[PDB]
Write a protein that binds this DNA or RNA. Structure first.
Lengths: 159, 260, 188, 146, 131
RNA sequence: UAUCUGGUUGAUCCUGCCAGUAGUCAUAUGCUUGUCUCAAAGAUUAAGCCAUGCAUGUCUAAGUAUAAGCAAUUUAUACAGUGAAACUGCGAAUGGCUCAUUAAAUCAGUUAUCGUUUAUUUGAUAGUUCCUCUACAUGGUAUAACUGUGGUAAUUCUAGAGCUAAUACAUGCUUAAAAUCUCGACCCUUUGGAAGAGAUGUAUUUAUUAGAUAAAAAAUCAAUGUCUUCGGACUCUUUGAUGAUUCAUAAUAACUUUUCGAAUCGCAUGGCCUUGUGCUGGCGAUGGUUCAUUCAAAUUUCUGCCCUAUCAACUUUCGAUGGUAGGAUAGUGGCCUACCAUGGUUUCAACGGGUAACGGGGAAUAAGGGUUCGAUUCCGGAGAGGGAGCCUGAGAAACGGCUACCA
RNA sequence: GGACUUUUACUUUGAAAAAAUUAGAGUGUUCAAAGCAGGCGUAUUGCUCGAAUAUAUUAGCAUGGAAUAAUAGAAUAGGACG
RNA sequence: GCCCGUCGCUAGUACCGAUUGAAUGGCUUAGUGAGGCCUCAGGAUCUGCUUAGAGAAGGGGGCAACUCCAUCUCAGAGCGGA
RNA sequence: CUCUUAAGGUAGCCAAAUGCCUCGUCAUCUAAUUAGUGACGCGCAUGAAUGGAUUAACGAGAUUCCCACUGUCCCUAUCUA
């Protein structure tokens, strides 16, 4: 049952200290390492299965494989990621491009679509307007009271 | 103990809340906030132990979650928020304006002030510092920092703050004579003038005091909270004016007021 | 691992101590960054409460300051010459605080000869105006001047490379340079 | 027992960040930073017209005096730049309504400013861990006997 | 981790278990006030002792002592409110001469009898404990 | 609540024990047992071993919904309700249990941080980012759940192929005016002057500087600052906290595998005029750098422990006491390392040994003084079968975390 | 007028000082052990007293005292006061 | 009358004692040394910058000439990261 | 108390280089010991300068065991003069 591990070499099972972002191990809590068994990277006869990936296609067709083909499941969801998919440009308004899929109830079928994220909206532009306002306004106001005090200070001296 | 503590065993809580002995193992335990947790007062204890506006601690939250209560003008919603001295608390939906200010025992009395006055408080300054970019600032006893202060303001002097703008609006210095509130110790709840400050280099200056009855008591500089001029308070003192009477004189005032 | 605790020590009376508790992390210590000379290699180390420290363990080029001339220039650091703590640091050429190292002199040359318009012991108008004023002030020590001929300057390291990651120092002047000079011909 | 000719240690002996420009001829060959200790302790002449270094000196150095100001008699000067003070007292045993003579030895740093010997009532002041045993620092020194 | 719901005991058995003298006197008492056992006298004998002690201590103090006057008159005012101390025997000297039957008399038991209602303490017993 | 009595003689008075007497927040055991209130309870011996179940998880209006989920309608052809799963965030360092270790340790009262770290709460705090033709009407990759191909007897095991999100990961624009600086084309020779070119956020690291004072007057050298009546003159000139600092804070020259300086979310739907989906604009949420506050932590000053000499010298092994420098740490420090000295404790009991020893708040015993006890409702400490090591995080040398040896 | 013991012990009075426990004030848990409650009234939109006080015998800190008991000082004068 | 010691029987207790006696714990000389941590390396697989040649874009602005930014596609030649 | 024949084995020590029975009995050491040691003693037939008991040091003396060691052995092989 034990999985081969990328580039251990050897043709035998061993036990490594595995971590996060490492194959053959999903951490059950943050910082949890685990001594787990693992199979080598070299092919021996002790293999139950052996995954291969096809690089160059050969002479004849492979019935389950070359012949048939299967679709992706999800389409693009980000603004530009939709743009990039169909090849649009910055000013092309993705909204009318997003993938929609039909769902059948009993007698009322309907379609649905993502929720274009990262999409520039009237709302977003209003938020940037606020941040800008607050920053410059608060700066001037902080300079208002700055000189205001410095003059209140001179009259602790000049008098 | 591997980190900060999160519980309060009901017995290790401050006595001046007057929670019962039985009826549970734990006390509220003030959250982190404006006042030191031992010197504070949770809103749960005010709103159900001190006002009886609630019974369950559940109904405490339900009141708070209604935003029914401001502290110093800002609407606070943490069940165990740590309110304290000079704070205001405003239950709007019933036209009530209080001010957590001391008993004559050492407790937080239910002191009701007007719909005005709640528009300000007082603040004992703790430090006066030169901040960065040359800006100066003071720090008051409730974790308020006010940048650009009156150069006259030194440490221990009190400060008249607004309550919707910050900003100091006049203040009082610490010299002989001033009217002083004791904020802890054996004389917590008492009020009086000054007479003397006995400074001690190395540490701990004591401040002799005299009330409006020619009784002289002493405390540590730490506990003294100036609140105005002789016979002239900058706020409304609770009943009894924090004058303190003996158990003898107590008993007489009881039986005499008792009957008729 | 390492523990900076005092419990494992003896009492001054000389009495031994039974172990009171196991080791806590908040008394730990770490192994030295022994910072050698070479291509820049720095690793960081997560310290108490967020906070980064910088394990500089390979350094050429530090930022040094000619103290009297009021400026600073980043040089290269040739080798380690002396070390009051341990000569092994010297032999393996190891950079610590209070190290005494030889650094490039050419960035300090290019400043002097252009700030003052002079050469170290062998046009335009405002250029001459400046030089003329800056003169009668631009003669330095002969114990410092003659060093430029070799192209390497005696300097002392004031940073803490296992901590900051920088090997910043200051070129030896005054009696300080006088003192380390004396020590450099008695032994080296 | 003896104070070095300053530059005795393999490292150069100087006060941190007290610089004197070589391009500027003066009177004193080397500047001298000293401070006033506090609590009305008068800094000695020796702490000023000296070239001793001592980064653990109350004046002229990088320590400070806060906490407890103690006093005991000198019992061992045999160390270097630190001594042993004895602090005598009387513990009270309630049962016998009486007392017993106890004593403590308290290691203290002694600046080169003071030239102190066994005898000598001494006034030390607390000052952060200087060095394992040592936690206090000579600050004032009352006479011997003659 | 709760709070120790405090308590204390009420009586105090005699130092000497068999005093024909003492045992007689105790039995006389148990019969005229109609008690149930010796514990009901031990309870009162003990109560009496603290009172006499409390007063024994207050009297050693200098008179007009702030604590003596408060804690004494408070003691006296309580003893009178129950019918054990005479209306004008309001002195600590007179509470040290107080004895067991003073207390014993004021029981509901010997009140249900002492004013009609019963015509017997043993009758009065059952009358009280039967609502 | 200041008490005694029985037993040595043939008899007497003493010494002197034993025995009686009385209580025990004192445990067990025996016999007996109706009512009310209150309610301790596998500490003692074995910190001995543990079957099985449970004890830590968590969502707002407000980070991520293309469930081939459900309700259904929305005005909804981007999304819009409710929402499995999964990612992101926070918590899991609190609690609860026990008393094994521990005798100058812990603990107590009392200090110290002018010797440090601190998620969070609370109050403050950011016009400077590019550059001698730039996305800002908004940059770029990847992954889970899912899909399908699977392995193993077995577990909170997971492989390889395919998809797609972010407040995840990685990138990256932006803003007024002045001023002070350095480099200096050039012009005109005098008291000589400059055209515009670059530099100036914060944080990082190093050096240098300011951060004045108890009371007063000149002389010059050095480099240059106002002026006027062009001879020479110069006044009213500024600086904070502490018992004390190289303090706060500012400045100069630079340094940097460059820290931060909002590419985020919910409600609201307003106002201007050249009417463009133009400009402005409300109430919050969540972030954020630095300081303050708070909840803390870590060390720390003084004094205080039971039996013991059939324990009198101990300590420097292989750091014991100190000095100098360094390294290390969040920081002080023989904490560690080099070099240097020979110091440090002790009959006022060191050192060692024993304890059926966690410290204290307190408990039992009532003339007073004392005697004995404290595993155990609160506080502090320590530990999670024994040791050591460590990942994560603000915090753990954590065990309902991991790694190893041992049992 | 502020600081002020040659250096102490002692003694007075205060200060900082957890709660529970103990001592002890009030209160009719029906009594009591307890608890910290509660009490009055037009009881149909109310009023009101409380939750004291004492104890800490060591040490530290602040303070009034100078009896008792310790201690220093001018003898080759290397003395005091200005 | 009282009374002392050997000797004699029974039971109990401690002591001495071959066994280079035994057990548990603490601390240890010598030799051996797991693991994670730090470090010199290693480099299954990944990947940022730069450069010439090629194909397809749009103009920084012209009667023919001239010249930037961004995106992405395959021989290479460099220096870097995980 | 008695007889032989003058006394009648004391202090000590032992299956001892002296014990027949005998490979004594108990204990210890071993898997197992006619061995060794510690004990016991009616000792065929120990015993006091015919010297008795103890004894540190010494021994190419006799005897047991442990560690180390090793071709003594299991079990033999190979090489040189």
């Amino acid at each position: 049952g034990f999985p081969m591990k990328q580039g251990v070499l050897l043709p035998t099972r061993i036990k490594l200290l595995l971590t996060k972002n490492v194959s053959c191990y999903r951490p059950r809590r943050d910082g949890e390492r685990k001594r787990k068994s693992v199979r080598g990277a070299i092919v021996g006869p002790d293999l139950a299965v052996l995954a291969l990936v096809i690089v160059k296609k050969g002479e004849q067709e492979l019935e389950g494989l070359t012949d048939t083909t299967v679709p992706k499941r999800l389409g693009p969801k980000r603004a530009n990621n939709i743009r990039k998919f169909f090849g649009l440009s910055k000013e092309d308004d993705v909204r009318d491009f997003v993938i929609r899929r039909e769902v059948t109830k009993g007698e009322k079928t309907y379609t649905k679509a993502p929720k274009i994220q990262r999409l520039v909206t009237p709302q977003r532009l209003q938020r940037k307007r606020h941040q800008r306002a607050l920053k410059v306004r608060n700066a001037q106001a902080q300079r208002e009271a700055a000189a205001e005090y410095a003059q209140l200070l001179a009259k602790r001296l000049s008098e | 103990a591997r980190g900060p503590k999160k519980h309060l065993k009901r017995l290790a809580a401050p006595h001046h809340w007057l929670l019962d002995k039985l009826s549970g193992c734990y006390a509220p335990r003030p959250s982190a906030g404006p006042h030191k947790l031992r010197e504070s007062l949770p809103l749960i204890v005010f709103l159900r132990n001190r006002l009886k506006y609630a019974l369950n601690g559940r109904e405490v939250k339900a009141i708070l979650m209604q935003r029914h209560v401001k502290v110093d003008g800002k609407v606070r919603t943490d069940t165990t928020y740590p309110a304290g001295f000079m704070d205001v608390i405003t239950l709007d939906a019933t036209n009530e304006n209080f001010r957590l200010v001391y008993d004559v025992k050492g407790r937080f009395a239910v002191h009701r002030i007007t719909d005005e006055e709640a528009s300000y408080k007082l603040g004992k300054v703790k430090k006066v510092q030169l901040g960065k970019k040359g800006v100066p600032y003071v720090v008051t006893h409730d974790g308020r920092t006010i940048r650009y202060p009156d150069p006259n303001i030194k440490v221990n002097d009190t400060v008249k703050i607004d309550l919707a703008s910050g900003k100091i609006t006049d203040f009082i210095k610490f010299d002989a004579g001033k009217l002083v509130y004791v904020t802890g110790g054996r004389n917590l709840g008492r009020i009086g003038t000054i007479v003397h400050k006995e400074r001690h280099d190395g540490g701990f200056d004591l401040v002799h005091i005299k009330d409006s009855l020619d009784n002289t008591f002493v405390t540590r500089l730490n506990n003294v909270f100036v609140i105005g001029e002789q016979g002239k308070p900058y706020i409304s003192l609770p009943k009894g004016k924090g004058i303190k009477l003996s158990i003898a004189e107590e008993r007489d005032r009881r039986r005499a007021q008792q009957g008729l | 691992g390492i523990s900076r605790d005092s419990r494992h020590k003896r009492s001054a009376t000389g009495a031994k101590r039974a172990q009171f508790r196991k080791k806590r992390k908040f008394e730990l210590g770490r192994q030295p960054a022994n910072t050698k000379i070479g291509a820049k290699r720095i690793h960081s180390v997560r310290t108490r409460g967020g906070n980064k420290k910088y394990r500089a363990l390979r350094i050429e080029t530090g930022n040094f300051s000619w103290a009297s001339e009021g400026i600073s220039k980043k040089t290269r650091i040739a080798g380690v010459v002396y070390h009051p703590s341990n000569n092994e640091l010297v032999r393996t050429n190891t950079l610590t605080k209070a190290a005494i190292v030889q650094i490039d002199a050419t960035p300090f040359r290019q400043w002097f000869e252009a700030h003052y318009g002079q050469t170290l012991g062998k046009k335009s108008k405002n250029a001459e105006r400046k030089w003329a004023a800056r003169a009668a002030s631009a003669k330095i020590e002969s114990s410092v001047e003659s060093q430029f001929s070799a192209g390497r300057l005696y300097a002392c390291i004031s940073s803490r490379p296992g901590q900051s990651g920088r090997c910043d120092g200051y070129i030896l002047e005054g009696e300080e340079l006088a003192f380390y000079l004396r020590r450099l011909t008695a032994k080296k | 027992s003896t104070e070095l000719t300053v530059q005795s240690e393999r490292a150069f002996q100087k006060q941190p960040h007290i610089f004197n420009n070589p391009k500027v001829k003066t009177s004193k060959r080397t500047k001298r930073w000293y401070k006033n200790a506090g609590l009305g302790f008068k800094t000695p002449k020796t702490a000023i017209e000296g070239s001793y270094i001592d980064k653990k000196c109350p004046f002229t150095g990088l320590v400070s005096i806060r906490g407890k100001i103690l006093t005991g008699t000198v019992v061992s000067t045999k160390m270097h730049r630190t001594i042993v003070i004895r602090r005598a007292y009387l513990h009270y045993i309630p049962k016998y309504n009486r007392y017993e003579k106890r004593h403590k030895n308290v290691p203290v740093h002694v600046s080169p400013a003071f030239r102190v010997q066994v005898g000598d009532i001494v006034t030390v002041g607390q000052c952060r861990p200087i060095s394992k045993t040592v936690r206090f620092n000579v600050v004032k020194v009352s006479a011997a006997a003659g | 981790p709760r709070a120790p719901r405090t308590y204390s005991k009420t009586y105090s058995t005699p130092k000497r278990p068999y005093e024909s003298s003492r045992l007689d006197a105790e039995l006389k008492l148990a019969g005229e006030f109609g008690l149930k056992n010796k514990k009901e006298i031990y309870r009162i004998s003990f109560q009496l002792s603290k009172i006499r002690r409390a007063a024994r201590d207050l009297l050693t103090r200098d008179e007009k002592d702030p604590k003596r006057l408060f804690e004494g008159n408070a003691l006296i005012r309580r003893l009178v409110r129950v019918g054990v101390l005479s209306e004008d025997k309001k002195k600590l000297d007179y509470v040290l001469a107080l004895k067991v039957e003073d207390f014993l008399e004021r029981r509901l038991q010997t009140q249900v009898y002492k004013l009609g209602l019963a015509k017997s303490v043993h009758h009065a017993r059952v009358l009280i404990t039967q609502r």
